[PDB]
């Protein structure tokens, strides 16, 4: 299925994922596509920061859902 | 895609320049303080040196007056 | 986390630290690397001497920051 990852600058990535994929697999797919290390990524959907171990189905993330990506680039 | 990558690389370059500026600002502030601290410690030891300096010259002036008295006495 | 300590003799020391390490604990790590007793160490960051009881996070000393080591009398 397709989900979207939107940054606060309005730029949007499209990812093909499975409902059983963990959030860590999602951050890995973002690194494979954008070169952003997972330790710099934070993902938000439906008012929650997403935990790496949980699956997309755990957070009720279905097709065409849009996640918000936040980068930790300062202080770390 | 590419544009999300370009925005990430720009922000990484921006953070790196911000860290070089803080590293330079820190080093400039510390070296200025250290140079001030070393000058104060050097000044304190010079004043201790001059205190011993006039102590020994006072002792020499006292020894000269005694030497003069002894020379007049023993030279018959 | 990693920080650096620059001495007045031109050597830079590398220390593995956590943000909650106290300055005295940092002085202890310098003793492990150089044999310099902690009571003889003065650490300087951002133009100020660091107090033994305070932590690195209190001074906002982040990763790869450089501390300045000045020895006492």
Residue numbers in the entry:
A (entry chain D): 1 to 76
B (entry chain A): 113 to 188
C (entry chain B): 1 to 73
Question: Which passages does the manuscript contain on this structure?
Answer:
Recognition of ubiquitylated products by RNF168 relies on three distinct UBDs: MIU (motif interacting with Ub) 1, MIU2 and UMI (Ub-interacting motif [UIM]- and MIU-related UBD). Currently, it is postulated that UDM1 and UDM2 interact with different ubiquitylated targets: UDM1 is associated with RNF8-dependent polyubiquitylated targets, whereas UDM2 recognizes RNF168-dependent monoubiquitylated targets.
On the other hand, the other two crystal forms (forms I and II at 1.78 and 2.25 Å resolutions, respectively) contain two stoichiometric UDM1–K63-Ub2 complexes in the asymmetric unit. No large conformational difference in UDM1 or K63-Ub2 was observed between the two crystal forms or between the two molecules in the asymmetric unit. LRM1–UMI binds K63-Ub2, where Ubdist and Ubprox interact with LRM1 and UMI, respectively (1250 Å2 and 1090 Å2 buried surface areas in forms I and II, respectively, averaged over the two complexes in the asymmetric unit). The main-chain amide groups of RNF168 Ser111 and Arg117 hydrogen bond with the main-chain carbonyl group of Thr12 and the side chain of Glu34 in Ubdist, respectively (right). Note that the Ser111-mediated interaction with Ubdist is missing in the form II crystal, since it contains only residues 113–188 of RNF168. The Cα–Nε distance between Leu71 of Ubdist and Lys63 of Ubprox varies from 12 to 16 Å in the different complexes in forms I and II. Although the difference in the Cα–Nε distance (4 Å) suggests that the interdomain region between LRM1 and UMI tolerates some flexibility, the positions of Ubdist and Ubprox in the UDM1-bound K63-Ub2 seem incompatible with the binding to other Ub-chain types.
